[PDB]
Write a protein that binds this ligand. Sequence first.
Ligand SMILES: [Cl-]
Length: 231
Amino acid sequence: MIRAVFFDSLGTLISVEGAYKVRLKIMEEVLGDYPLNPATLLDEYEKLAREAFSNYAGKPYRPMRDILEEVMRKLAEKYGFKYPENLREISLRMACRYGELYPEVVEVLKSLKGKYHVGDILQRDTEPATAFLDALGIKDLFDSITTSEEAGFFKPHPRIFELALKKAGVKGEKAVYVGDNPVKDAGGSKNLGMTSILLDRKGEKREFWDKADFIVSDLREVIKIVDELNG
Ligand SMILES: [Cl-]
């Protein structure tokens, strides 16, 4: 039977408008009156971030805040603005202020928490990630929160999933993983026997549906999938 349901909250439960706005507001704060369009800085930042993290996939963990500060140092050098001090404080304040959940998230976590181990699996430094979940109001709705910093390796390394399963006290065949990227999950979670649910809210990942056991566009579908897997 299914006894655990794992999510990737900061990645499958944060609205796209909210996440973009958090990041835009960070760039606006970094730049102040410097004459660079914050949306261009954000685009360039995202590119470099993705690159830098690509170099780390599967590798031993390194604080992501350190990685993102190195990226921002390159952007400051590129565009000529002064490197912002206390970038991680700016980022945490903006996340807590403008972060926003998809509308059905709280209901789905509450409905599941009574009958399953409800877990979060996050590739984020544990301290800011947990503060963000606290600010979003959902930290205590999870039975467990597991991070790459705790596991010691970046996805798709499976250690993060192994640790999340240990916290739930079950082997992977008893668990579902809800994610939005079947790359970091299939190379890690499918090896452990977990059932993968791909969240594709706008039907834009059809070329990756084959790497998922189920596809949903609304998180309320997850409850039905698991209740039936158990019926
Ligand atoms: Cl982080």
